[PDB]
Amino acid sequence: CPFGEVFNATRFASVYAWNRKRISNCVADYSVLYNSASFSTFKCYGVSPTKLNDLCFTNVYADSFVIRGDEVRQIAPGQTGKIADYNYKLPDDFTGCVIAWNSNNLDSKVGGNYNYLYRLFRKSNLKPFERDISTEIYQAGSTPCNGVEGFNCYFPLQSYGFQPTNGVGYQPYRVVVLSFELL
């Protein structure tokens, strides 16, 4: 309902932690969107194009984050990859639909941007619509590590690095998804 604003902000969140925004009691018809000039990906499965003009105003949410270009394939249901079992998980049935767009001028300082992180290591895959923020040393193998971070144990959060001269697949992209449900 103020989503016309959420597409217009100053900074997003990382992938290991995102924003949960509720929307309710409104009138939105979803025609001013889906038809613009700054879009690049509008992938929807549960509702057809121009079919989201029915009973919809029941417990809708928004969530926004940033990834790099050659990763948007991992978001869609199925399609196992790197960040599909460790940072964000999305089941097969209940997907509202996905939207994403390039943002290289809002980010990518010439020197290098390190305001974004993402998880790399975990003991098991994430369950649908889960989250985690804990930061503990990763016990790889069979040996007790405690803070040492020397060998067989390291920190699981790493930075991206964004420069203005990278390729089309290494530039930052912002993404938001929708969640359409029924009472």
């Binding site: 790889a140 390291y154 420069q163 089309v168």
Partner: protein, 711 residues
């Protein structure tokens, strides 16, 4: 276990990307604009990458290798677990580095100056190459060929004599037998069950594939000799070899500067579309656009849209310090650039294709892990680049793009001209490469002592290549160390395998595009099967054994030579006709100086009984000085001149155990002058008694063959 190696690689792959990116950006920023803060901004970034790589190398040793079954991580760890030169002591590394630096600077800044006017000295690149590649004067070329070696080669003898030993130690500390067996470690694979290759097999493959090129090289040699017998009369015999200073440069690596003396039809100029590129107003951009269009035609992708603004295609307007050597840069993270100063000639028109080949190869394996982004071996990256420039400069393709009017027709004389101009550069450099690498291997392994280097060198030169020296070089010179690759510690075998891979690829691709004529008119434009065959091999990289990647294109397992012979047939059937009268081959006994020499034979026991001294080299010194004194006295007391001969104007050859050798004399400071045999005979007839008394020999122990005693 494997999980640990997988995670370790997962972390290394994420650090190396950024570290390498910054390291390369520094060097690009320096090379594009030379200043005095860029070097300091680049050196530290390079040192950081070196330090990180060494640390991770020494860390990766905690994993035993013989437990891994995934071939990919096996190859990655094998490429990371290497040790390098950081295995010797510390002071040994210091000594080696000092030796290498000294050799590099000695090669870079040596000088020779004229004996007439000793105030003008010349360097190697500006001026000596000019004298050697432009002149037509026998004496000037002889002076230039002799002085470079005599003044610079000697300085490099006692350094090389240590370099060898140290490198051998550094090799034997790594489970290799010597350094040559360390250099042959790229054409090696293990455990594919049908695709193996050992280190000792490369030698036999090279020696067995070379012996089928001799029938063509012999005819080319005979023709070039019969054509040189006209520009230097009375200096070349019709059944001997070629003197080493008449080839076209300081060493004879390429013969491509003899073309002006060897055109088969000098009244038929070859194709050169240069005025058509200035009457049609072609600027820099259009050339690269046409190159991109050609590459698109075969079924390969476009450019990256970041390649058009980030690159630097033409020389800066302001006179700006920026080295310009046309190169292709793969910085990383989907960034590709080109660096050159594009003039407007057909030369740069072909160089553009040759350089864009590297970029089109680099854009293909960018989906592999970090450590596996190279070529299959040393020969692929340049062959893939050159088969494009080979197929871009044909008359058909040149007339289709719009640079040649359709009124142009083809005459077979121009065909022969083109084929010979290509042969003089392709076939002329195989014997030299084979000989040099063979000599280096035999020296490194130990089959040649430290007192037979410059004898085996000049025997292998006459036996294989067919080239003789003009002045006898004793065991103090060092001729193979006056070349860029030998004194700067580089390998030399890739230049031999690339030339075979090139023609193999060409014949394999010209069969998918349905060619019908000769192999040197072929073209791969407007094709879609050739492009797919090539892209099915570009995308592999080092993640597969090279002997399998070679089969995905041709359909064989080893390098072959017959495709190179099918390319040069219409020249063979013409040389075989032109060499009907001349003598095909050469004899290894002639010499450019073996008709003004005298032979000396000494018998010690017969004269001195059981008191004869032993004949070391100090006696040779005494003999040379005595002959010099005799020449002085003869000139003074007959010709009424005062010339100052010395003990270095007497040249000696063919020393044997029963003391017997040849010698001859030379003017004081003019190497291309020779005192004839008759004057030396007269001068020795006059002072024989003193030469005899100096040694205690009695006219029957010391024999000059040809001078009969009468008094």
């Amino acid at each position: 276990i494997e999980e640990q190696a997988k995670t370790f690689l997962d972390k290394f792959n994420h650090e190396a990307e950024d570290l390498f990116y910054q390291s390369s950006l520094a060097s690009w920023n320096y090379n594009t604009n030379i200043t005095e803060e860029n070097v300091q901004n680049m050196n530290n970034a390079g040192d950081k990458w070196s330090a990180f790589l060494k640390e991770q190398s020494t860390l990766a040793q905690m994993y035993p290798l013989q437990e891994i079954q995934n071939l990919t991580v096996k190859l990655q760890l094998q490429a990371l677990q290497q040790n390098g030169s950081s295995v010797l002591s510390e002071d040994k590394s210091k000594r080696l580095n000092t030796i290498l630096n000294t050799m590099s600077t000695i090669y870079s800044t040596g000088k020779v100056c004229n004996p007439d006017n000793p105030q003008e000295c010349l360097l190697l690149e500006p001026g000596l190459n000019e004298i050697m590649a432009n002149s037509l004067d026998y004496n000037e070329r002889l002076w230039a060929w002799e002085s470079w070696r005599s003044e610079v080669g000697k300085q490099l003898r006692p350094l090389y004599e240590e370099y060898v030993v140290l490198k051998n130690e550094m090799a034997r500390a790594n489970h290799y037998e010597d350094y040559g067996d360390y250099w042959r470690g790229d054409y090696e694979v293990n455990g594919v069950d049908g695709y193996d290759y050992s280190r000792g097999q490369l030698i036999e493959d090279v020696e067995h594939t070379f012996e089928e090129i001799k029938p063509l090289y012999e005819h080319l040699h005979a023709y070039v000799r019969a054509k040189l017998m006209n520009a230097y009369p009375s200096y070349i015999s019709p059944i001997g070899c070629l003197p080493a200073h008449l080839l076209g440069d300081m060493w004879g690596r390429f013969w491509t500067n003899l073309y002006s003396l060897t055109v088969p039809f000098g009244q038929k100029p070859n194709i050169d579309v240069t005025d058509a590129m200035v009457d049609q107003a072609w600027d820099a951009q259009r050339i690269f656009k046409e190159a991109e269009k050609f590459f698109v035609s075969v079924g390969l992708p476009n450019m990256t849209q970041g390649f058009w603004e980030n690159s630097m295609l033409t020389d800066p307007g302001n006179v700006q310090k920026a080295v310009c050597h046309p190169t292709a840069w793969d910085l990383g993270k989907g960034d590709f650039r080109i660096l050159m100063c594009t003039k407007v000639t057909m030369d740069d028109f072909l160089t553009a294709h040759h350089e864009m080949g590297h970029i089109q190869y680099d854009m293909a394996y960018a989906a592999q892990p970090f450590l596996l982004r190279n070529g299959a071996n040393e020969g692929f990256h340049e062959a893939v680049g050159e088969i494009m420039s080979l197929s871009a400069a044909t008359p058909k393709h040149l007339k289709s793009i719009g640079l040649l009017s359709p009124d142009f027709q083809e005459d077979n004389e121009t065909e022969i001209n083109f084929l010979l101009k290509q042969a003089l550069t392709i076939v002329g450099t195989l014997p030299f490469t084979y000989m040099l690498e063979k000599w280096r291997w035999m020296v490194f392994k130990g089959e040649i002592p430290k007192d037979q280097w410059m004898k085996k060198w000049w025997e292998m030169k006459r036996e294989i290549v067919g080239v003789v020296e003009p002045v006898p070089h004793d065991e103090t010179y060092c001729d193979p160390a006056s070349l860029f690759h030998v004194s700067n510690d580089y390998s030399f075998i890739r230049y031999y395998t690339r030339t075979l891979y090139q023609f193999q690829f060409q014949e394999a691709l010209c069969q998918a595009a349905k060619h019908e004529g000769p192999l040197h008119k072929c073209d791969i434009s407007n094709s879609t099967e050739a492009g797919q065959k090539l892209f099915n091999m570009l995308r592999l990289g080092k993640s597969e054994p090279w002997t399998l990647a070679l089969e995905n294109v041709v359909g064989a397992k080893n390098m072959n030579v017959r495709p190179l012979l099918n390319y040069f047939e219409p020249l063979f059937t013409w040389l075989k006709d032109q060499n009907k009268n001349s003598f095909v081959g050469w004899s290894t006994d002639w010499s450019p100086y073996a008709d003004q020499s005298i032979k000396v034979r000494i018998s010690l026991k017969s004269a001195l009984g059981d008191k004869a001294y032993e004949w070391n080299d100090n006696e040779m010194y005494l003999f040379r000085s005595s002959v010099a004194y005799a020449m002085r006295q003869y000139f003074l007391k007959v010709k009424n001149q005062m010339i100052l001969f010395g003990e270095e104007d007497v040249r000696v050859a063919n020393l044997k155990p029963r003391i017997s050798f040849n010698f001859f004399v030379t003017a004081p400071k003019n190497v291309s002058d020779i005192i004839p045999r008759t004057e030396v005979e007269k001068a020795i007839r006059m002072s024989r008694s003193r030469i005899n008394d100096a040694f205690r020999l009695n006219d029957n122990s010391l024999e000059f063959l040809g001078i009969q005693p009468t008094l």
